[PDB]
C-alpha cells in the first residue's frame, strides 16, 4: 500500500507539493500571465514553505486591488446565498461574520479562521502554496486539517477562477467545516482514503467533486447549492440553478465514473435528495474502499492507528 | 447537580483553589515552618496564579538545596524501583529518563514534561499552587489535564512529605500517565466524577487513594507497589512491602469506606490481584455512580457533552 502520514506533523512531508489545473496558457484566464499577480503568489508561496506544524499562520497585508476583489466577491455572493445557498450553509455564515470578521471590507486572516474552527469542530488551517493532489488534501481531512491558501484570485475575473484561491477556501469550504456533522463526515472519508488504492481515491475524489465541490440538493420543493465550488463563484452560482446545466439524480455507481471539467463551469450537476442523503451516500461508498488493514485517528496523540 | 466545567479553559475557574493536609502545626514536619521554604512556595504559587490556559508553563531556576533534595529523592527511589515498583512502571521510567531529562542532577521542567505527555497519551500539565480538592483534580482528568506542582519538598525530610510536591507528581504520577491504557483509565473515572453527587466523589477518592495513590498488587508470586504515593516516597516504599503494614484483598465494597491517613505512612494497604484487575474494579465502580444525565468529552473541541 502507498505510504501515508501517521502524524499530523508528517503532513509537511507531502505538504506544499502544489499543482495546477493547467489553465495558465488558457486565453480564457489572462490573469495568470499578470507578472504582478505571479510575484504576489510567489510571496504567499514562501510563507507556506517557511511554515511548519505548530506555529500560528503568519498574518499578511493585502493590496488595494486584492481588497477590492474580496469586496466584490463577498458582497455579490452574500446577496446570492439568500436564494441559492442551502439551509445548513446560510445558518452558519452569520457566525463567521460576527465571530471571525467575514466582511465586505475585511479579508479574514487565516490564523483567526483556524482558531474559530478549532473551537467549533476541531478543524484547523494549514497555509499552502496552491492546489494539492486529491490524495494529500483528502488525507489531511483525517487529522481535521484543511490545507488552505492565502492568495486571492486575479481582480480581472472575480466571478470565477479555476484555482482554489482564498475566496474559495473561506467562502465555500470553511463554513461547512464549522459544522460538527459535516466535520465528522469530512474526516471519515479522509480516513478511508488513507493508504487506499489509487483507483479508489480518484473515484472518491470524483464523488467529492460532484458533492462537496459542486453538489446540488433539493430542500422542500426547491433546489439549492451546497458545493464549495458553487458557493465561492457568484458566476456559476447563478448558472448552476439556471436551465443551462444538465441535472441528474445523485447515484454513486454512476457519479463515481462521471467526467467533469476543471477550467470552466460544470456542464452537469448531480442533485441529491437532500444535504443529508448526500452525506449518507458518500459515507457508505467511502466505507466500501478495500484495503489490507483498518485505521483510526487518535485525537489525543494526533496519530493514525493501523488496525 | 453541582456545576462542573464544560471547557478545558473553564478549569481556571476552580483552578488554584489550593488546600492542605493540615500538617503545618505538626511537630513531625518542621519544614513547613521554614520561612525560606514558605517564601519559595509563595513564588511558585504566583506562577500558578499568573498562568492561564494555552501559555507554556514558565521555566524556573531551583536553589542548590532544592537540586540536592531531588538528587537524593531520585537516586534513592531509582534504586528501590528495581525490586519494589510494578512491571508497568519500570518499563516506562527509562523513557522519561532519555526523552524528558529525568536525572539525578536535573529537575525536569514542567513544560518539557507536559509536551512529552501530549505526544504520549494526550495528557498535559497545568501548574498549581498546591493541593487541590479531589473533585477538582478528578474533574481535570476528564480533559486529560493533570494539575501539577512546581515546588519541591523541604530538604530536611526527603524520605517523605505529606504534601504533593514536584517529586510526587513527576516520579509517582507522570510515569503511568504516559501509558495509554492507564491514561484512558484515568480519564474515565474523571468523567464519571463530573457533576456526580458529593457522596460518590468521596467514595471514588477513597478508592483512588487505595489504588492510584497507595495501591499494591501482586505480579507472579510476588508483590509490588503501583501507587503514586508509594512510588514518590522512598520512605514508605520500603515500608509498604515490609511486614509492618497490614495487607488486605482489594474489595470495592470494603475499600470505598475504609479510613486512611494523610500526614503519615498508611497503616493499611489493599493488594490487587494484578495491576489490570485493579483498573477493572475501579472502572466498574466508577460506572456505577448515579446521576440525572451522561457526559462525553469531545477531544476535538475540548468540551464536555451532556447526554
Ligand atoms: C479532493 C479534491 O480534489 C479537492 O478539490 C481538493 C484538491 N486540492 C485542494 N488544494 C487546496 N489547497 N485547497 C482545496 O480546497 C483543494 N481541493
Ligand atoms: C483525587 C485525590 O484526592 C488525589 O490525591 C489528588 C488530590 N489533589 C491533588 N492536587 C495536586 N496539585 N496534585 C495531586 O497529585 C493531587 N492528588
Ligand atoms: N471555480 C471556483 C474555485 C474552485 C472550485 C473547485 C476547486 S477550485 C471559484 O471560482 O470559486
Ligand atoms: N507522601 C508522598 C506524597 C503524597 C502522597 C499522596 C498525596 S501527596 C511522598 O512523600 O511522595
Ligand atoms: Fe474545494
Ligand atoms: Fe497523588
XYZ file of C-alpha atoms and ligand atoms in Angstrom:
672
model
C 0.000 0.000 0.000
C 1.095 3.607 -0.557
C 2.921 5.237 2.342
C 0.569 7.536 4.228
C 1.218 10.019 7.068
C 0.823 8.706 10.609
C 1.245 12.041 12.378
C -0.308 15.463 11.953
C 3.287 16.723 11.821
C 4.081 14.352 8.930
C 1.705 16.383 6.769
C 4.622 18.681 5.944
C 6.205 15.654 4.217
C 3.657 15.775 1.393
C 2.647 19.345 2.185
C 3.358 22.098 -0.335
C 3.507 19.709 -3.292
C 1.299 22.208 -5.137
C -0.192 21.511 -8.563
C -2.385 23.251 -11.148
C -5.491 22.828 -13.369
C -3.461 23.681 -16.456
C -5.323 26.930 -17.050
C -2.144 29.035 -17.342
C -1.747 29.110 -21.129
C -5.542 29.449 -21.304
C -6.636 32.560 -23.212
C -9.840 32.400 -21.176
C -7.911 33.218 -17.981
C -5.366 36.005 -18.807
C -4.858 36.787 -15.113
C -2.265 34.052 -14.617
C 0.021 35.941 -17.026
C -0.066 39.100 -14.906
C 3.543 39.475 -13.647
C 2.272 41.353 -10.578
C -0.141 38.505 -9.835
C 2.665 35.937 -10.126
C 5.037 37.873 -7.853
C 2.241 38.135 -5.323
C 1.693 34.353 -5.499
C 5.408 33.823 -5.042
C 5.201 35.765 -1.740
C 2.337 33.649 -0.344
C 4.129 30.522 -1.509
C 7.171 31.404 0.640
C 5.008 31.815 3.732
C 3.616 28.338 3.108
C 7.085 26.885 2.570
C 8.548 28.605 5.636
C 5.632 27.337 7.691
C 5.818 24.272 9.958
C 3.322 22.486 12.219
C 2.631 24.306 15.461
C 3.345 27.940 14.628
C 0.418 30.301 14.091
C -0.337 31.237 10.483
C 1.567 34.453 9.583
C -0.713 37.480 9.179
C -0.296 39.436 5.938
C -1.297 42.699 4.284
C -3.256 42.787 1.057
C -3.074 45.301 -1.785
C -5.875 47.749 -2.605
C -6.822 45.650 -5.629
C -6.920 42.444 -3.589
C -9.299 44.047 -1.046
C -11.469 45.222 -3.934
C -11.694 41.708 -5.352
C -12.721 40.248 -1.991
C -15.210 43.087 -1.624
C -16.810 42.338 -4.964
C -16.791 38.577 -4.449
C -18.102 38.733 -0.859
C -20.867 41.282 -1.377
C -22.060 39.544 -4.530
C -22.180 36.029 -3.098
C -23.796 37.179 0.147
C -26.668 38.511 -1.966
C -26.944 35.198 -3.861
C -26.774 32.950 -0.767
C -30.260 34.050 0.335
C -31.889 32.280 -2.623
C -29.147 29.889 -3.786
C -27.278 28.553 -0.746
C -28.639 25.566 1.169
C -30.183 25.932 4.638
C -27.214 24.482 6.558
C -24.839 26.958 4.926
C -26.971 30.091 5.477
C -27.383 29.457 9.191
C -23.643 29.157 9.724
C -22.450 32.108 7.670
C -23.635 34.701 10.209
C -21.340 33.124 12.829
C -18.252 33.689 10.674
C -19.465 37.245 10.141
C -19.720 38.213 13.791
C -17.118 35.855 15.238
C -14.488 35.795 12.525
C -14.561 39.129 10.740
C -16.049 37.969 7.433
C -16.958 41.332 5.952
C -17.021 43.101 2.606
C -14.104 45.333 3.548
C -12.014 42.903 5.545
C -10.199 39.865 4.191
C -10.160 37.389 7.135
C -6.746 36.302 8.472
C -6.181 32.554 8.339
C -4.990 32.381 11.959
C -8.232 33.807 13.300
C -10.141 31.489 10.973
C -8.197 28.436 12.115
C -8.787 29.383 15.765
C -12.522 29.735 15.107
C -12.628 26.247 13.560
C -10.702 24.645 16.442
C -13.307 25.739 18.961
C -16.066 24.659 16.536
C -15.210 21.174 15.331
C -11.509 20.731 15.913
C -10.597 21.545 12.286
C -7.529 23.752 11.761
C -5.984 25.503 8.752
C -2.585 24.950 7.209
C -1.351 27.527 4.620
C -0.395 26.006 1.290
C 1.130 27.488 -1.891
C -1.653 26.282 -4.160
C -3.567 23.267 -5.450
C -2.894 19.934 -3.720
C -3.472 16.451 -5.094
C -6.753 14.848 -4.080
C -4.824 12.216 -2.081
C -2.984 14.795 0.080
C -5.933 17.139 0.648
C -8.160 14.137 1.442
C -5.525 12.652 3.721
C -5.308 15.901 5.654
C -9.010 15.714 6.480
C -8.233 12.594 8.540
C -6.493 14.831 11.090
C -9.153 17.514 10.611
C -6.609 19.707 8.893
C -7.718 21.820 5.947
C -4.829 22.849 3.667
C -5.805 26.427 2.866
C -4.486 29.114 0.504
C -3.812 32.832 1.329
C -3.648 34.406 -2.127
C -6.712 35.818 -3.844
C -7.920 35.420 -7.422
C -6.949 37.940 -10.127
C -9.101 41.082 -9.944
C -9.892 40.886 -13.670
C -12.316 37.946 -13.268
C -13.810 37.842 -9.728
C -16.858 35.910 -10.946
C -14.824 32.733 -11.442
C -11.307 31.309 -11.133
C -10.116 27.764 -11.913
C -7.695 27.832 -8.959
C -8.683 27.312 -5.303
C -7.981 30.884 -4.064
C -8.728 32.242 -0.583
C -12.273 33.152 -1.643
C -12.994 29.513 -2.465
C -11.465 28.176 0.781
C -13.133 30.652 3.137
C -16.488 31.205 1.419
C -17.016 27.715 0.028
C -15.266 25.322 2.452
C -14.740 26.880 5.876
C -18.447 27.440 6.625
C -19.426 23.768 6.483
C -16.196 22.737 8.259
C -17.548 24.575 11.297
C -20.463 22.131 11.390
C -19.971 19.065 13.590
C -21.894 16.596 11.458
C -20.152 17.789 8.276
C -16.817 17.920 10.086
C -17.029 14.275 11.176
C -18.297 13.458 7.668
C -15.222 15.048 6.108
C -12.810 13.263 8.472
C -14.358 9.844 7.830
C -13.897 9.920 4.061
C -10.409 11.276 4.708
C -9.644 8.305 6.934
C -10.937 5.881 4.286
C -8.618 7.391 1.669
C -5.521 6.787 3.786
C -3.379 4.125 2.155
C -6.276 3.295 -0.157
C -5.583 2.078 -3.702
C -5.130 4.929 -6.158
C -8.078 3.684 -8.255
C -10.467 4.197 -5.322
C -9.035 7.584 -4.303
C -9.809 9.008 -7.766
C -13.347 7.574 -7.625
C -13.623 9.118 -4.173
C -12.347 12.449 -5.487
C -14.841 12.371 -8.363
C -17.679 11.811 -5.841
C -16.229 14.518 -3.584
C -16.239 16.763 -6.640
C -19.887 16.118 -7.502
C -20.936 16.616 -3.863
C -18.660 18.697 -1.596
C -17.355 20.709 -4.569
C -20.316 21.129 -6.922
C -23.101 19.225 -5.210
C -26.704 20.363 -5.546
C -29.647 19.286 -3.360
C -33.367 19.830 -3.044
C -34.779 21.060 0.264
C -38.559 21.133 0.291
C -39.988 21.854 -3.168
C -36.867 23.740 -4.225
C -33.226 23.251 -5.097
C -30.093 24.803 -3.583
C -26.300 24.594 -3.934
C -24.153 23.118 -1.192
C -20.880 22.612 -3.044
C -17.842 24.721 -2.143
C -17.129 25.305 -5.830
C -20.565 26.776 -6.325
C -20.643 28.692 -3.031
C -17.416 30.579 -3.913
C -18.165 31.582 -7.529
C -21.049 34.037 -7.950
C -20.525 33.346 -11.618
C -21.659 29.762 -11.771
C -23.728 30.064 -8.628
C -26.241 31.862 -10.808
C -25.658 29.305 -13.561
C -25.923 26.067 -11.534
C -29.567 26.907 -10.792
C -30.490 28.207 -14.245
C -31.670 25.901 -17.044
C -28.343 25.764 -18.867
C -26.757 22.967 -16.773
C -27.912 19.371 -17.020
C -29.281 17.858 -13.808
C -29.263 14.230 -12.748
C -30.184 12.258 -9.613
C -27.242 11.520 -7.322
C -26.209 7.880 -7.848
C -22.743 6.732 -6.746
C -22.439 3.877 -9.247
C -22.868 6.497 -11.978
C -21.430 9.631 -10.358
C -18.130 7.947 -9.432
C -17.269 7.421 -13.106
C -18.689 10.675 -14.489
C -16.472 13.174 -16.313
C -16.134 16.803 -15.207
C -14.230 19.978 -16.085
C -11.693 21.954 -14.070
C -11.254 25.213 -16.012
C -14.898 26.080 -16.743
C -18.453 25.843 -15.354
C -19.649 22.251 -14.949
C -21.968 21.202 -17.782
C -23.604 18.714 -15.396
C -24.580 18.627 -11.693
C -25.950 15.784 -9.559
C -28.959 16.654 -7.394
C -29.156 14.864 -4.058
C -32.492 14.094 -2.392
C -31.212 16.266 0.472
C -27.968 17.524 2.012
C -28.378 14.644 4.489
C -28.880 11.963 1.858
C -25.796 13.313 0.087
C -23.651 12.631 3.158
C -25.198 9.183 3.691
C -24.278 8.065 0.173
C -20.644 9.225 0.292
C -20.033 7.588 3.686
C -21.355 4.220 2.561
C -19.180 4.355 -0.550
C -16.157 5.522 1.438
C -16.683 2.611 3.810
C -16.553 0.324 0.760
C -12.950 1.119 -0.172
C -10.981 -2.134 0.258
C -7.528 -2.310 1.874
C -5.351 -4.874 3.762
C -5.988 -3.087 7.080
C -8.020 -0.544 9.049
C -7.147 2.844 10.514
C -8.178 5.040 13.430
C -7.099 8.586 14.273
C -6.277 9.247 17.930
C -7.273 12.893 18.636
C -5.333 12.811 21.914
C -1.914 11.940 20.491
C -2.818 13.147 16.995
C -1.717 9.946 15.257
C -3.192 7.310 12.945
C -3.606 3.805 14.381
C -3.256 0.897 11.950
C -5.693 -1.869 12.900
C -26.313 18.721 40.387
C -23.109 20.621 41.192
C -21.848 22.945 38.471
C -18.966 21.326 36.615
C -16.594 22.712 33.950
C -17.615 22.211 30.328
C -14.410 23.523 28.768
C -10.734 22.820 29.315
C -10.396 26.599 29.674
C -13.013 26.635 32.460
C -10.559 24.703 34.625
C -9.080 28.037 35.704
C -12.474 28.744 37.327
C -11.859 26.146 40.039
C -8.120 26.073 39.404
C -5.735 27.285 42.103
C -8.215 26.688 44.925
C -5.337 25.048 46.809
C -5.798 23.244 50.123
C -3.691 21.394 52.703
C -3.441 18.159 54.759
C -3.244 20.159 57.975
C 0.332 19.104 58.668
C 1.584 22.676 59.215
C 1.394 22.866 63.014
C 2.640 19.262 63.042
C 5.837 18.846 65.071
C 6.553 15.816 62.892
C 7.014 18.062 59.835
C 9.058 21.153 60.925
C 9.853 22.041 57.307
C 6.593 23.921 56.772
C 7.762 26.457 59.381
C 10.935 27.253 57.438
C 10.475 30.911 56.361
C 12.737 30.303 53.350
C 10.599 27.320 52.344
C 7.414 29.403 52.613
C 8.812 32.295 50.557
C 9.857 29.791 47.927
C 6.318 28.339 47.867
C 4.919 31.835 47.543
C 6.995 32.288 44.350
C 5.704 29.080 42.713
C 2.187 29.998 43.779
C 2.395 33.278 41.817
C 3.454 31.454 38.662
C 0.397 29.232 39.029
C -1.879 32.212 39.635
C -0.434 34.216 36.737
C -0.863 31.200 34.489
C -3.779 30.768 32.065
C -4.803 28.046 29.601
C -2.729 27.996 26.439
C 0.580 29.518 27.504
C 3.558 27.221 28.044
C 4.492 26.513 31.662
C 7.105 29.084 32.822
C 10.575 27.582 33.296
C 12.227 28.276 36.656
C 15.561 28.000 38.445
C 15.982 25.943 41.583
C 18.250 26.567 44.567
C 21.268 24.398 45.399
C 19.333 22.805 48.256
C 16.340 22.051 46.037
C 18.584 20.275 43.488
C 20.125 18.294 46.339
C 16.713 17.150 47.547
C 15.695 15.990 44.068
C 19.068 14.284 43.752
C 18.587 12.367 46.972
C 14.961 11.507 46.249
C 15.588 10.475 42.619
C 18.708 8.382 43.158
C 17.178 6.631 46.154
C 13.864 5.747 44.523
C 15.514 4.639 41.281
C 17.411 2.060 43.337
C 14.186 0.887 45.031
C 12.102 0.683 41.825
C 14.066 -2.367 40.635
C 12.619 -4.538 43.416
C 9.583 -2.523 44.563
C 7.966 -0.864 41.537
C 5.487 -2.796 39.400
C 6.369 -4.009 35.893
C 4.324 -1.376 34.027
C 6.074 1.432 35.897
C 9.653 0.152 35.429
C 9.301 -0.192 31.671
C 8.122 3.389 31.286
C 10.601 5.141 33.551
C 13.513 4.761 31.112
C 11.540 6.750 28.511
C 11.241 9.759 30.826
C 14.959 9.410 31.504
C 16.117 9.601 27.907
C 13.262 11.634 26.445
C 12.445 14.016 29.262
C 15.615 14.650 31.226
C 14.709 12.743 34.395
C 18.125 12.591 36.021
C 19.708 12.769 39.454
C 21.200 16.186 38.767
C 18.424 17.737 36.730
C 14.979 18.687 37.990
C 12.699 18.293 34.917
C 10.873 21.413 33.671
C 7.098 21.049 33.619
C 6.799 22.364 30.050
C 9.028 19.642 28.651
C 7.146 17.103 30.760
C 3.764 18.314 29.535
C 4.985 18.175 25.921
C 6.208 14.604 26.434
C 2.786 13.574 27.777
C 0.891 15.215 24.897
C 2.695 13.095 22.332
C 2.215 10.026 24.570
C -1.422 9.948 25.614
C -2.728 13.459 25.171
C -2.320 14.337 28.874
C -0.952 17.811 29.654
C 0.237 19.562 32.822
C -1.195 22.637 34.478
C 0.888 24.309 37.259
C -0.964 24.681 40.537
C -0.038 26.339 43.859
C -0.627 23.225 45.934
C -3.139 20.571 46.968
C -6.456 20.517 45.086
C -9.751 19.039 46.237
C -10.460 15.531 44.992
C -13.392 16.877 42.935
C -11.247 19.402 41.004
C -8.233 17.142 40.440
C -10.565 14.305 39.383
C -12.546 16.627 37.142
C -9.367 17.729 35.405
C -8.610 14.144 34.409
C -11.732 14.259 32.213
C -9.878 16.627 29.871
C -6.650 14.670 30.382
C -5.220 17.567 32.330
C -3.032 16.838 35.338
C -2.838 19.757 37.795
C 0.831 19.630 38.753
C 3.010 21.424 41.316
C 6.484 23.020 40.731
C 7.819 23.365 44.273
C 9.858 20.640 45.931
C 9.611 19.174 49.425
C 11.697 20.571 52.306
C 15.274 19.254 52.205
C 15.114 18.232 55.877
C 12.874 15.198 55.206
C 13.292 13.923 51.604
C 12.109 10.435 52.578
C 8.514 11.613 52.983
C 6.291 14.694 52.749
C 2.532 14.949 53.381
C 2.137 17.476 50.543
C 2.034 16.598 46.824
C 5.378 18.209 45.819
C 7.027 18.007 42.390
C 8.726 14.732 43.344
C 5.340 13.111 43.929
C 3.814 14.451 40.683
C 6.722 13.564 38.399
C 8.000 10.351 39.996
C 4.687 8.920 41.165
C 2.048 10.174 38.690
C 3.578 11.250 35.385
C 5.057 7.836 34.508
C 1.732 5.993 34.401
C 0.024 8.974 32.713
C 2.266 8.278 29.726
C 0.612 4.869 29.370
C -2.382 4.729 27.025
C -4.398 2.152 28.930
C -3.806 3.948 32.247
C -4.413 7.313 30.594
C -7.845 6.289 29.294
C -8.481 4.668 32.692
C -7.758 7.943 34.472
C -9.972 9.982 32.119
C -12.935 7.622 32.500
C -13.138 7.876 36.284
C -12.646 11.619 35.867
C -15.613 11.768 33.514
C -17.763 9.782 35.963
C -16.980 12.248 38.759
C -18.227 15.221 36.749
C -21.399 16.563 38.321
C -21.598 13.427 40.454
C -23.101 13.606 43.952
C -20.556 14.595 46.581
C -21.136 11.321 48.474
C -19.928 9.295 45.474
C -16.951 11.556 44.708
C -15.534 10.955 48.209
C -16.056 7.190 47.833
C -14.342 7.488 44.464
C -11.482 9.453 46.018
C -11.075 6.857 48.773
C -10.817 4.114 46.102
C -8.449 6.298 44.065
C -6.404 6.659 47.238
C -6.179 2.920 47.903
C -5.281 2.228 44.255
C -3.721 5.061 42.210
C -2.219 6.645 45.345
C -1.193 3.746 47.586
C -2.284 0.684 45.650
C -0.319 -2.551 45.892
C -0.550 -5.540 43.523
C 0.897 -8.996 43.076
C 2.578 -9.882 39.783
C 3.570 -13.525 39.595
C 4.466 -14.929 43.023
C 5.487 -11.510 44.320
C 4.088 -8.149 45.321
C 4.894 -4.654 44.035
C 3.752 -1.050 44.538
C 1.918 0.828 41.814
C 0.550 3.774 43.777
C 1.892 7.276 43.128
C 2.124 7.902 46.870
C 4.365 4.899 47.295
C 6.384 5.470 44.113
C 7.387 9.003 45.240
C 8.383 8.316 48.870
C 11.447 6.091 49.301
C 10.490 6.227 52.944
C 7.286 4.255 52.847
C 8.221 2.500 49.639
C 10.479 0.376 51.804
C 7.740 0.170 54.432
C 4.756 -0.753 52.217
C 6.490 -4.041 51.365
C 7.824 -4.814 54.842
C 5.755 -6.671 57.454
C 4.732 -3.581 59.410
C 1.726 -2.602 57.234
C -1.486 -4.603 57.229
C -2.479 -6.114 53.881
C -5.952 -6.912 52.621
C -7.501 -8.105 49.343
C -8.833 -5.304 47.145
C -12.634 -5.210 47.511
C -14.543 -2.067 46.500
C -17.493 -2.601 48.848
C -14.969 -2.538 51.700
C -12.212 -0.298 50.322
C -14.608 2.544 49.448
C -15.487 3.046 53.122
C -12.049 2.378 54.620
C -10.247 5.027 56.677
C -6.765 6.292 55.791
C -4.191 8.852 56.927
C -2.808 11.899 55.138
C 0.158 13.003 57.278
C 1.854 9.640 57.896
C 2.552 6.216 56.341
C -0.619 4.214 55.685
C -1.194 1.556 58.350
C -3.102 -0.496 55.761
C -2.787 -1.255 52.019
C -5.114 -3.149 49.672
C -3.443 -5.733 47.430
C -4.984 -6.170 43.993
C -4.845 -9.494 42.143
C -2.928 -7.571 39.463
C -2.432 -4.038 38.139
C -5.014 -4.991 35.489
C -7.604 -6.271 37.941
C -7.125 -3.057 39.919
C -8.175 -0.971 36.910
C -11.115 -3.272 36.119
C -12.575 -2.846 39.605
C -12.332 0.960 39.710
C -13.919 1.348 36.260
C -16.909 -0.808 37.136
C -17.444 1.157 40.342
C -16.963 4.479 38.556
C -19.552 3.400 36.004
C -21.932 2.804 38.925
C -22.081 6.435 40.056
C -25.694 7.582 39.531
C -26.635 10.975 38.060
C -29.568 12.572 36.129
C -27.536 12.571 32.891
C -24.491 11.326 30.980
C -21.357 13.071 29.746
C -18.851 12.764 26.916
C -15.642 14.711 26.320
C -15.041 15.872 22.745
C -11.236 15.825 22.201
C -11.645 17.869 19.011
C -13.384 20.892 20.531
C -12.147 20.112 24.047
C -15.592 20.309 25.650
C -17.887 18.115 27.744
C -21.121 16.949 26.098
C -24.129 16.451 28.375
C -26.173 13.477 27.166
C -10.056 16.425 -3.057
C -10.454 17.302 -4.206
O -9.550 17.146 -5.305
C -10.496 18.839 -3.834
O -10.976 19.524 -4.998
C -9.139 19.451 -3.318
C -7.917 19.379 -4.249
N -6.798 20.247 -3.767
C -7.016 21.340 -2.987
N -5.935 22.115 -2.572
C -6.068 23.232 -1.793
N -5.045 23.964 -1.394
N -7.350 23.600 -1.427
C -8.547 22.890 -1.791
O -9.627 23.332 -1.405
C -8.316 21.732 -2.611
N -9.467 20.933 -3.047
C -8.082 12.768 43.915
C -7.185 12.530 45.093
O -7.605 13.306 46.220
C -5.670 12.880 44.806
O -4.940 12.515 45.984
C -5.385 14.372 44.385
C -5.793 15.487 45.363
N -5.204 16.807 44.980
C -4.058 16.902 44.253
N -3.552 18.161 43.930
C -2.404 18.344 43.209
N -1.927 19.534 42.897
N -1.719 17.212 42.809
C -2.131 15.859 43.081
O -1.423 14.942 42.672
C -3.345 15.758 43.843
N -3.858 14.426 44.184
N -14.169 27.779 -9.516
C -14.240 28.070 -8.051
C -12.940 27.616 -7.385
C -12.717 26.110 -7.265
C -13.688 25.128 -7.330
C -13.147 23.776 -7.169
C -11.749 23.749 -6.980
S -11.250 25.373 -7.034
C -14.477 29.564 -7.779
O -14.189 30.381 -8.684
O -14.577 29.910 -6.583
N 3.638 11.160 50.813
C 4.002 11.244 49.366
C 3.274 12.430 48.733
C 1.766 12.290 48.539
C 1.048 11.109 48.506
C -0.386 11.316 48.294
C -0.745 12.675 48.164
S 0.705 13.547 48.331
C 5.519 11.389 49.167
O 6.200 11.815 50.128
O 5.930 11.443 47.989
Fe -12.592 22.916 -2.961
Fe -1.171 11.882 44.072
